Structure formats: C-alpha cells, structure tokens
Design a protein around this ligand. Structure first.
Ligand code: CO
Ligand code: CO
Ligand code: CO
Ligand code: CO
Lengths: 323, 323
C-alpha cells in the first residue's frame, strides 16, 4: 500500500504514470578524483534536474524511479530538493553497480575478511528501513547489476543479500544487464534464493534484439524493462528501431503486463563535462526524458499499439510492481 | 627553494626529518557507497590523526608526505587541520591508484572520448600549480601506481601525463609498486618520457627481497623507498626481518643517498571499521608510525649503521629530492 520516496511514504495507488529508470545525477566511479576540474555545482545542477522533472510532468509523469548506484554518486538529499521543488515523486535505490564499471575494491576487501555479504545485507536493511546516511530518506528499491556474459563472484554477493532483504522487506529489485546478457540467469539466480518474481524488474532488456531471449526471461514471471530508449551506438546499444521491433513482437505476443519503458537518462553528469565526438553525438541526440513521449510512443501507435496497452505499461505495471 | 604543503609554501631547507610515505586517511574505492554504516566521523578521526602526528613529532619528525590517491579518499582540507593543530609539515599528492584497486571507470570512459591523457595532465597541472578543489591547497607530489607484473594501459596514461607535468613544473613523483614488481620498469618508462630521476621515488621497494632487483632500479639514478615497515603477511608483504636484510645489503654497497624509509600507515580507515583475524593481526601489530624509531632504527644501529647514514636517509635525501 505505501512506497518510500525521497519525500517519505506515498500510496502506491497515487504513483500514476511512471518512468521506471532515469538518473537525475550519475558519475562513473573515480569521478570524485577529478573534483578540481569537475566540481559539482549545486545551483546549476538543481536547475537542470528541476527542468528535467518539469519536462516529464508535461507528459503526465508523476513518479520516477532513480536507481543510481551507491558507488555512482547517488545523492538522495539532492533528489529530495528536486521533488520538493516540482512535486514529482522520486524513488531511489540502495545497491552497487556491476564489477566492470563499479567500485569493487571496498567490498572485495570485505569479502577477503569474510563479512562482505552480511555487510551488504546490513546496508540494504538500513537503507530500506531506517534511512540513508543522515538524510532520513529510505530507498524504495534495491539495485542490482551484472557483467557482460556472467554474474561475477562479487556481483553474486549483492544478489544474495538482495534476495534476503527482499524476503524481509518486500522491497522491489531493479537490475542492470550488461550488453544484452544474463537476463534469464539473473531471474533464475534471484528466484533460486527465494526472491519474488512479481517484485523484480530485469533491466536493459532492450539491449538484446532476439525475442526468444526476452521470452525466456519472461517465463520466470518477472518484469522486464526496455529502459534505454535514445541510447544508440554506445555501450553496445542497438538502435531505437531495433528496440521498437523487439518490443512490438512481445506486445503482439500479449506480454504487456510484464513490460515497462524508460530512457536511462543521465541529466547531470558528475565529474568533468565532456562532449561526444561525431558520429556518436548525432546517434545519441534523442537521449532525453521526452523521447518516449515525442517519438517512441507515436511510433508504437503508428504500428497499432493501443492506449490501454500503453497505460498498462506506464501506470498499471508500476502500481502492481510496488503493491 | 620552496615546496607546497597543505599550509602553503615551506622552504625545503626547513623540512628536516621526514617520513616519505604515510596516510592520515585512506579508503578503498567504493567506501563512499557504505556511507550509512561507514560514516566519516570527522572529530574522532581528527583526534586520531593528531595523535599520530604527535607520535611522529616525539621522534623528531617535522614533515610527512601523504600520497593518498585522489580516488582513495584524499582530503587536503582535513590534512590542513592536522597540520594546523600540530605544526607538522604535510605534503599531499595528485594522482590515481593502480587499476586493480583504484576506480578506473571514470578515466577509462574519458579514454574512449580521446581526452583522458590530456585531462590527467590538466588535473596534475591544476593541482600542482593552482589548487585542489576550492581549498587553496596545492599538491607537492604526483602519485603514480602500477599493478602486479604490469603497468597497464590505463596506468601508463598517468605515467605519461606525470612525465609531462614534471617537465613543466619540476614536481616530485612518488610511486606505488604492487607486490614487489615493476620497479625497474617504472623508472625506465618514466625516463623514456623525459622525467628527471633525481625527482622520482619508486615506492614499496621493500616488497621485493632480491637485492639485484633493487640495484636494477637504483641504476636509473632514482630514489627508492622501503616504505612499508610493519606490514607483514598482508598485501603479499615480506617480513620486517627480510626488509632489514635487504636494506643492509644496499647500505653495504653505499646506496644510502638513494634510499628513504617509511611505514605506509593508514591512521584512519574510511568506510566501516573492520578487524583483522589472527594470525594476520599479530603479524601486523607493529604497523604504526613509531615502529621505525622504536624497533627498526635501533636494529640498524645494532648492526653498526652510523648516524650520518640514518640522517642522510631521513633528512638529506628529502631535502635533495625536493630541491
Ligand atoms: Co544500468
Ligand atoms: Co541506469
Ligand atoms: Co601504495
Ligand atoms: Co600508500
């Protein structure tokens, strides 16, 4: 009945239209070391994040899940300023990123000491049930992430701790899959450890363009997310045209009660600014929070997808996920 | 001639007795994600750090080089409080740790963009000549680090950028070698890119117990540091008995003008506290800032090492290094 947002508990029935995966802030681990040339400018960053929230609201979005990992610059107090300013519900995560682009040395060291997995569970419980740091904000989701072609020994500690914490709390799990791999394996591994499929979203499933891989994942009874619309050419991503093709195949198969959509935007980058060289910059030009509404949903309706199906994905599914 | 300390420029002739490698604070990358259970308690940490500084002062230390990497919790403003409270000269570093236990995703991403190496050089120059973040503090050394048996392509970006910054500034370079590997290779690679051997300290050389390896490094004209006294068993480290044996062999050969000593202490760990299991805790019991003075130096004196050679290593060498 309630879910924890950065402004406290909100009834699940009031979440309304939701984007299941976007970042207001994000940095690659190591951004902290480039603080001199890459300082976090609070005022300007807040203006940018607020403008992003305002754009989302213009398209009827009432709730965003921001699954920024703990080791990637997660800042709940900043998210609260955005929500307090805009009235958008923002739900944040507890979790670490995958080994390949995360910051594994700290918990790798605790693994060597023999405490890491219990420590991770302790962290999850604290952040889900007590609060993050001194912010008073509880996470509403656990974020998990795996590597390309395998769930590493490091990552599996977090998967196990997540299943444990979920059993205790009923918290939703949101995942990252890398380059269209491990969707089935993530679902299997979590359910093998007692997690509830109706509380799991296997993420970045748009990264794979073979609909049998999606069907295999969907057979576990989990949610999947096509959550990187607008990301093309980069991080091994297929095109939006390929995402749409794959998505249409599944909707025409009747899977709409298991699918959610999003962009995985990064609205403010932590660390030093950068510009993408061509041709990448042109390929990435639609990576923004209005793209689903301006471009993708019209293309879906232009291929016969009806409003009730879209509403199932954006409103119905988040309501069920968090219930 | 001056060197930049956390309190501003200090004449090199006033550095006096120096510990070339100690950490007041240090965290394994990822510690930031465990903020809820592993919070930074600034008062208590300052008290602990000040107490370490007072211990060093009692053995006549006036200056400490703290080469904590930028991605391992470096905190120049905290160091300044330690210095202000104690009158100790503290010199800090600019640099990133080795790939294996650092936070490489950030600059790996910039490498994809084509700018990483130039960005690293720019960071070095900013921090050596302008200031770190908004603290007004300049670094007095560049910290470099390599992996076990390899200077990786990520690491070499920093090595090349350091040689470049050193040519422009005359800055001192201090390095980390992993598990007694790559000393000769580091010296050779830096020299190949125009760095000045009289401004280079190859660190953790006590990690290798074969004096031939030391002489190969010494042949480049660089300083070497036996800087992990008291670390035994962990991190592949030899015993202090082995360190001393190796050091005496080199002092027999007359290399004292290229050698410096330290402990590489971590006086305050960032993140959540931990306990070492026995047997390691017992092996590690002498890892503290007084060990060189209470235990090691007296053993060297027992063996007939003259005060002038000890003074060369602790006073003469740092003066020459920074001149
Ligand atoms: Co992701
Ligand atoms: Co994401
Ligand atoms: Co080191
Ligand atoms: Co060190």
């Amino acid at each position: 009945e309630m879910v924890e947002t950065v402004c406290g508990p909100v009834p699940v029935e009031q979440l309304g239209k939701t984007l299941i995966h976007e970042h207001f802030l994000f940095g690659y681990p190591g951004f902290q070391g480039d603080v001199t040339r890459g300082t976090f400018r609070e005022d300007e960053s807040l203006r940018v994040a607020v403008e992003a929230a305002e754009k989302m609201k213009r398209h009827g979005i009432q709730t965003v899940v921001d699954p920024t990992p703990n080791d990637c610059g997660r800042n709940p107090a900043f998210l609260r300023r955005v929500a307090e300013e805009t009235g958008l519900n923002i739900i944040c995560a507890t979790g670490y990123y995958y080994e390949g682009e995360g910051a594994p040395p700290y918990f790798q060291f605790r693994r060597l000491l023999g405490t890491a997995e219990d420590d991770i569970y302790d962290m999850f419980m604290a952040e889900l049930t007590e609060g993050i740091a001194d912010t008073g904000i509880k996470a509403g989701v656990i974020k998990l992430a795996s590597s390309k072609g395998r769930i590493t020994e490091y990552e599996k500690m977090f998967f196990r701790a997540a299943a444990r914490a979920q059993k205790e709390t009923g918290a939703v799990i949101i995942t990252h899959t890398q380059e269209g791999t491990m969707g089935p394996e993530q679902a299997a591994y979590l359910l093998e450890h007692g997690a509830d499929p109706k509380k799991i979203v296997i993420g970045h499933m748009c990264g794979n363009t073979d609909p049998d891989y999606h069907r295999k994942t969907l057979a576990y009874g989990v949610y999947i997310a096509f959550d990187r619309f607008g990301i093309q050419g980069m991080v091994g991503a297929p095109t939006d045209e390929e995402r749409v093709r794959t998505l249409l195949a599944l909707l025409r198969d009747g899977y709409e009660k298991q699918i959610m959509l999003s962009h995985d935007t990064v609205n403010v980058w932590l660390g030093r600014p950068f510009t993408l060289p061509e041709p990448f910059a042109e390929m990435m030009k639609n990576w923004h929070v209005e793209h689903l509404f301006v471009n993708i949903i019209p293309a879906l309706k232009n291929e016969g997808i009806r409003d009730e199906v879209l509403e199932q994905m954006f409103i119905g599914n988040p309501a069920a996920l968090f219930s």
